């Protein structure tokens, strides 16, 4: 009864570094100069169409 | 934009940007090989015979049929596999 890994015929598997972890941290996407970002503060906004605030 | 009443002296031999084209094409040619495969397990002992053909002793067959050991996807098991090459890529190492 001899087995093998399932990825033996597509790719060598990069082992993840056990030093680095996969917890999420909050990323803030900032716009460069000359650009702005607009956020819609309307409560009943279904994400399509004109937002009033 | 077609000019008027103007004249400059040209020289194709001391010209720039042909060197830049040469360097750009060489480096771009090198850049299209880094994702591709290196043939490290392939420089190996090749058991080659003549191609199956009506052999003329005065001329030479331009195809050699070579079988060899090759590593499989598994490191423990290795296989025997054959292929065809030309004379201009193989040389005899020094019966068998």
């Amino acid at each position: 009864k001899e087995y093998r890994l399932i990825n033996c015929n597509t790719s060598a598997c990069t082992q993840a570094c056990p030093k680095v972890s996969f917890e999420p941290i909050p990323i803030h996407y900032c716009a460069p100069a000359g650009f702005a970002i607009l956020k819609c503060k309307d409560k009943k906004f279904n994400g399509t169409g004109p937002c009033p605030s | 934009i077609h000019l008027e009443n103007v004249t400059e002296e040209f020289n194709m031999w001391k010209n720039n940007m042909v060197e830049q084209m040469h360097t750009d094409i060489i480096s771009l040619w090198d850049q299209s090989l880094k994702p591709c495969v290196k043939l490290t397990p392939l420089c190996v002992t090749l058991q080659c015979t003549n191609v199956t053909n009506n052999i003329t002793d005065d001329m030479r067959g331009e195809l050699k049929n070579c079988s060899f050991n090759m590593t499989t996807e598994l490191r423990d098991k290795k296989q025997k596999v054959y292929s065809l090459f030309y004379r201009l890529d193989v040389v005899q190492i020094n019966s068998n």
């Binding site: - | 199956t52 053909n53 009506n54 052999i55």
Partner: protein, 105 residues
């Protein structure tokens, strides 16, 4: 190698090794007790004396067996057939192919 076809029907006689490259077949026939006799000298060419309906496989096909197609058979075609392939990859055949015999009802 015994092939029997009630007379007036068609007939397909295979002979020799499978083709490798371009070939030039030669079909001979042999009545019992007689000398041999040419029937086909090219892939699909016959000389005078032998009539038509003795068709041959063309040599431009790669990786097939040489066949011999006979329609409207008779008691005269009851003989031993022989093939002589001339492949452009295999060497010169100083011996003929295997004896394929035809017998009729």
């Amino acid at each position: 190698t015994f092939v029997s076809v009630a007379p007036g029907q068609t007939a397909r006689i295979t002979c020799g090794e499978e083709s490798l490259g371009s070939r030039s077949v030669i079909w001979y026939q042999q009545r019992p007790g007689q000398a041999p006799s040419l029937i086909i000298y090219n892939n699909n060419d016959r000389p005078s004396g032998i009539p038509d309906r003795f068709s041959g496989s063309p040599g431009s096909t790669f990786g097939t067996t040489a066949t011999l197609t006979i329609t409207s058979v008779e008691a005269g075609d009851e003989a031993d057939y022989y093939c002589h392939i001339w492949d452009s990859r295999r060497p010169t055949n100083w011996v003929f192919g295997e004896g394929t015999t035809l017998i009729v009802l």
